[PDB]
Amino acid sequence: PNYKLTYFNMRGRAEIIRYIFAYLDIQYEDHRIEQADWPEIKSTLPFGKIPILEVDGLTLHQSLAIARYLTKNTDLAGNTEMEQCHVDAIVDTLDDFMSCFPWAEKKQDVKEQMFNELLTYNAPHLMQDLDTYLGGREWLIGNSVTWADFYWEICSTTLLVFKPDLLDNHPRLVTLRKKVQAIPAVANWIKRRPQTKL
Amino acid sequence: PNYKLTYFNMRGRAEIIRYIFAYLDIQYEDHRIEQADWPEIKSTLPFGKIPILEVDGLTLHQSLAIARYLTKNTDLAGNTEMEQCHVDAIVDTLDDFMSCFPWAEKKQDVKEQMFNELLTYNAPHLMQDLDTYLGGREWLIGNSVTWADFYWEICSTTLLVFKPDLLDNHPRLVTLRKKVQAIPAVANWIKRRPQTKL
Numbered sequence: 001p002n003y004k005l006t007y008f009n010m011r012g013r014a015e016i017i018r019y020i021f022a023y024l025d026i027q028y029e030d031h032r033i034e035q036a037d038w039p040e041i042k043s044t045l046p047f048g049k050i051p052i053l054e055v056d057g058l059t060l061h062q063s064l065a066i067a068r069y070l071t072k073n074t075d076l077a078g079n080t081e082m083e084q085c086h087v088d089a090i091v092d093t094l095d096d097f098m099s100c101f102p103w104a105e106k107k108q109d110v111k112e113q114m115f116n117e118l119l120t121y122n123a124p125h126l127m128q129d130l131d132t133y134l135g136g137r138e139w140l141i142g143n144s145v146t147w148a149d150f151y152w153e154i155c156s157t158t159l160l161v162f163k164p165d166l167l168d169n170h171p172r173l174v175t176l177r178k179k180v181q182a183i184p185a186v187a188n189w190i191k192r193r194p195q196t197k198l
Numbered sequence: 199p200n201y202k203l204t205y206f207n208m209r210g211r212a213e214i215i216r217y218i219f220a221y222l223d224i225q226y227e228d229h230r231i232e233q234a235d236w237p238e239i240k241s242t243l244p245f246g247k248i249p250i251l252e253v254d255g256l257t258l259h260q261s262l263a264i265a266r267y268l269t270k271n272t273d274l275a276g277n278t279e280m281e282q283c284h285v286d287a288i289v290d291t292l293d294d295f296m297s298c299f300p301w302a303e304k305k306q307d308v309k310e311q312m313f314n315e316l317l318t319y320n321a322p323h324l325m326q327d328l329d330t331y332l333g334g335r336e337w338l339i340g341n342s343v344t345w346a347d348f349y350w351e352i353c354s355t356t357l358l359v360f361k362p363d364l365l366d367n368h369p370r371l372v373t374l375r376k377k378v379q380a381i382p383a384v385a386n387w388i389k390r391r392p393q394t395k396l
């Protein structure tokens with residue numbers, strides 16, 4: 001296929017797609033726009049949002065819908081229909097929390113206050129639920145890595161920028177991050193990708 | 199399979215699962231809890247949110263994860279992987295918008311002003327995008343109904359409570375809603391289901 005991913009120059013909501021392409025060793029065009037390109041770009045998005053992925057001339061949208069598309073019938077999918085449901089559910093639990101953050105808030109004081117409140121009063125309950133769910137298992141779902149593990153690593157990377165102590169009570173969740181980071185194709189992408197805050 | 203769905207007494211985030219069960223003629227326990235009963239139940243749940251679906255004693259969570267699990271291998275799925283991606287993406291687009299509303303906000307003037315800003319400024323852009331996406335086609339994806347069409351009818355039902363003029367400029371979106379409503383198994387469920395606001 002010919003693949004063209006359009007997003008900002010940020011990890012953000014495109015990074016899960018970028019991990020998948022790295023892991024599966026699939027070539028793609030990583031098209032990164034500047035704010036100044038936005039109005040022109042937006043005018044041809046189906047729902048006014050990025051990322052989009054063009055696949056042989058047809059446009060897909062929604063980062064997690066695209067991630068699911070790319071991982072079907074690969075080793076990154078759940079190994080059974082039930083596990084596939086659990087992959088989807090963990091991803092949506094993570095994504096729900098990430099969606100609470102006011103990423104585009106222009107009032108910096110207002111934005112910071114909310115970030116800090118979410119990270120102090122809400123994040124610990126999620127981190128605890130994730131730790132309890134993971135227990136002593138190697139990966140979140142099944143006996144091998146899935147794209148839910150990738151999404152945990154991407155989301156927690158973002159959150160650690162703003163709350164360095166996020167995982168001080170959850171060494172098992174740190175171990176999982178490090179395991180994802182050590183997968184050779186992922187490690188290589190992490191080393192070479194453009195360095196951005198988010 | 200022995201299915202038990204747990205949610206509040208309302209359509210909310212369980213309603214998609216309820217339509218899928220009705221369309222597929224799958225029997226299930228439609229368990230609706232009181233607010234008073236919730237705290238005790240919430241403590242037994244890995245992520246402390248509803249809906250959950252118990253399948254032969256195994257607990258699934260995340261409404262759309264569950265919906266996808268139920269519709270795989272059925273005629274409510276898209277007919278290619280790419281069309282499955284389109285289904286997933288439309289549903290996430292609608293879910294992102296519904297999730298913008300502060301349904302549980304206790305500060306009532308901040309809730310009110312948020313609702314009115316989303317309805318006045320955000321909703322019309324989304325309706326225009328959905329209308330353009332549908333064009334003159336019969337269903338949102340492919341040549342037959344999918345669960346994306348159900349989710350459109352469900353989401354729009356709640357939006358129309360708060361914004362009765364939502365679809366005044368989008369008759370094709372009204373036509374779609376009515377087509378879903380006319381599907382006999384869906385019609386029967388809509389007739390019979392508990393009458394609730396949300």
Ligand SMILES: CCOC(=O)N1CCN(C(=O)Nc2sc3nc4n(c(=O)c3c2C)CC[C@H](C)CC4)CC1
Nearest residue numbers: 010011012013014035038098103104154155158198
């Ligand atoms: C996978 C977990 O997600 C993240 O890590 N992301 C961090 C970066 N986040 C982010 O920066 N979001 C942005 S960056 C951004 N920039 C523009 N606006 C926006 O709506 C946004 C939004 C929603 C759109 C409108 C114009 C172009 C102003 C700035 C997305 C969440």
Ligand SMILES: N[C@@H](CCC(=O)N[C@@H](CS)C(=O)NCC(=O)O)C(=O)O
Nearest residue numbers: 012013048049050051062063064294
């Ligand atoms: N759930 C969607 C969210 C898409 C989204 O909101 N993207 C943001 C940038 S990360 C955007 O395009 N914002 C433009 C706007 O809100 O007007 C996804 O994962 O693709």
Ligand SMILES: N[C@@H](CCC(=O)N[C@@H](CS)C(=O)NCC(=O)O)C(=O)O
Nearest residue numbers: 096210211246247248249260261262
């Ligand atoms: N995206 C999730 C959202 C789940 C969710 O937040 N559910 C709410 C009610 S609609 C809940 O359980 N709230 C009560 C609580 O947090 O204790 C889904 O679709 O299942």
Ligand SMILES: [Mg+2]
Nearest residue numbers: 092095290293
């Ligand atoms: Mg979502």
